[PDB]
């Protein structure tokens, strides 16, 4: 699990190893403009990995401008950690992972745990020299888009990962409400411990199970952005290591405002 996760104890221990470098990514910089780990950077989620016009994330060139600008490597291991429940830092996992970025983790229970053990935060700005990264084509193997979303309706697992009642059709969100036909429920939440940290293998294979993921079959997770569901995505195909997995990021504000899409109520 190192290979993708790391614990509060690694990171206190590495705040300052060779080619390690910790990116606090969050909805805003403002809880990160207060205080962060020692060190770390910071990605605005909105402004930075956003197209400010098209509906979509950065692509390829403009993503190796951002890092290049905040000073990361191809070569650096990093390491990611958030407040919201770590589910921007997990969206920013997949974009690394989308990316090509082979040596990336999460920090486990992100800026939640490290709070609650109490570990020292630095109220001080951090610059890094700007570098050189280039990243990869995207790998659209961890990726799905409405159409092949469509296509994958009786095919393949459909994890949604919304609120029980978004699911059944009972509330529209926070277009058209109910879920894709044949999907499953699994609120990102249940994944999750309290102080923060994923649970444990044992733990998440039963909960999938019990909800009804097909092993048979390959899978997608949807939320209504991709946020929540980049969470699940990442305990589905990195910690219990199924091998095809997508994030849905058009997710139900896409899918549920599609003409002519099917769409099932009830729980």
Known sequence: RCDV?????????????????????????????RDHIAGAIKLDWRTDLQDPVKRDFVDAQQFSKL??????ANEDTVILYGGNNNWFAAYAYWYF????????????????????????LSSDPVSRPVTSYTASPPDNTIRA????????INVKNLIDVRSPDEFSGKILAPQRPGHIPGAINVPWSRAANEDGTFKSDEELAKLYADAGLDNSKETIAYCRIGERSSHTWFVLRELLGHQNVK???????????????????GS
């Not at 614990?7 to 300052?16: G, K, P, Y």
């Not at 890092?67 to 990361?72: A, K, M, P, Q």
């Not at 994030?247 to 099917?262: C, I, Q, R």
């Open 247 to 265: 994030n849905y990021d058009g997710s139900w504000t896409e899918y549920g405002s599609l003409v002519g899409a099917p769409i099932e109520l």
């Open 5 to 33: 996760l790391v614990s509060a104890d690694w990171a206190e221990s590495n705040l300052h190893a060779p080619k390690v470098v910790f990116v606090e990514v969050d909805e805003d910089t403002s809880a990160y403009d």
């Open 97 to 120: 992972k989308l990316y090509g970025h082979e040596k990336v983790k999460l920090l486990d229970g992100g800026r939640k745990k490290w709070e609650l053990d109490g570990r020292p």
């Open 145 to 152: 888009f409405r159409d092949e979303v469509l296509a994958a």
């Open 67 to 72: 890092l290049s600008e905040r000073g990361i």
